[PDB]
Design a protein around this ligand. Sequence first.
Ligand SMILES: [Zn+2]
Ligand SMILES: [Zn+2]
Ligand SMILES: [Zn+2]
Ligand SMILES: [Zn+2]
Ligand SMILES: [Zn+2]
Ligand SMILES: [Zn+2]
Ligand SMILES: [Zn+2]
Ligand SMILES: [Zn+2]
Ligand SMILES: [Zn+2]
Ligand SMILES: [Zn+2]
Ligand SMILES: [Zn+2]
Ligand SMILES: [Zn+2]
Lengths: 47, 46, 47, 47, 47, 46
Amino acid sequence: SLLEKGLDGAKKAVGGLGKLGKDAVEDLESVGKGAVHDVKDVLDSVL
Amino acid sequence: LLEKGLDGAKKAVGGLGKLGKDAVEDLESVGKGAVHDVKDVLDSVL
Amino acid sequence: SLLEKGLDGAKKAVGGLGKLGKDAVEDLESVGKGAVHDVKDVLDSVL
Amino acid sequence: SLLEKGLDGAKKAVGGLGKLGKDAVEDLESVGKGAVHDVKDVLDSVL
Amino acid sequence: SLLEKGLDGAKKAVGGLGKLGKDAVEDLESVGKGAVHDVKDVLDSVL
Amino acid sequence: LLEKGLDGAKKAVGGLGKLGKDAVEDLESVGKGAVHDVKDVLDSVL
Ligand SMILES: [Zn+2]
Ligand SMILES: [Zn+2]
Ligand SMILES: [Zn+2]
Ligand SMILES: [Zn+2]
Ligand SMILES: [Zn+2]
Ligand SMILES: [Zn+2]
Ligand SMILES: [Zn+2]
Ligand SMILES: [Zn+2]
Ligand SMILES: [Zn+2]
Ligand SMILES: [Zn+2]
Ligand SMILES: [Zn+2]
Ligand SMILES: [Zn+2]
């Protein structure tokens, strides 16, 4: 039925977005934690 | 005092990342439950 | 259907606990790892 | 440096347990969820 | 030093591959578990 | 017997997915420990 295959297509999309999401959010954590490491690096040519 | 502040921002970031992936996970789980719960209803209707 | 809804009540309940156990852990490993880095700082402060 | 290596011994040890606790959980939620689906099958078999 | 920034670039790459990895592997789980759901769907126009 | 077999393959898949993300995680953690452990050594050398 177009229906079950409708809902599975919503389900499939719900999961798609949910990886884009979790991948943006993790790409973010790493930027944040990258930034801070790379700053600290600078506070070491200066130690 | 500086080091201690980098490790503040690094703990802020992680927490913020922890808070964020726990939103994504609760939103996909909503969605999927909707679709499930719509299955169940279009089902008493088979 | 009471019974289909009971069960999904169960499915959902597991998923909480499951995801709720997954924070607990994550929080433990960032604690263990927090103290470590934090001791690396003290011992470094006596470089 | 014994002490730097001690600590990393610790860091690594946490990471095991952490990641080792994360399987335990994952295994619990697929168990709970296993039984559920599996009961949905029985109750369906009396459709 | 080119060195610390060397190693961070390895570190950055180690993590990059480690997302490609974990994303292939999950894209796989879903295909596998997609396939099986969509098969079962077919065994229902036939129930 | 069929249903029971789909739920066999579905449990096979998950396990295989569980086994696989636990390789990726142990390989990135190797790598990163190498880089860390190379830091530590190029460090007694500051
Ligand atoms: Zn990306
Ligand atoms: Zn660095
Ligand atoms: Zn620190
Ligand atoms: Zn929540
Ligand atoms: Zn249901
Ligand atoms: Zn918490
Ligand atoms: Zn070390
Ligand atoms: Zn296991
Ligand atoms: Zn992809
Ligand atoms: Zn379907
Ligand atoms: Zn089944
Ligand atoms: Zn392992």
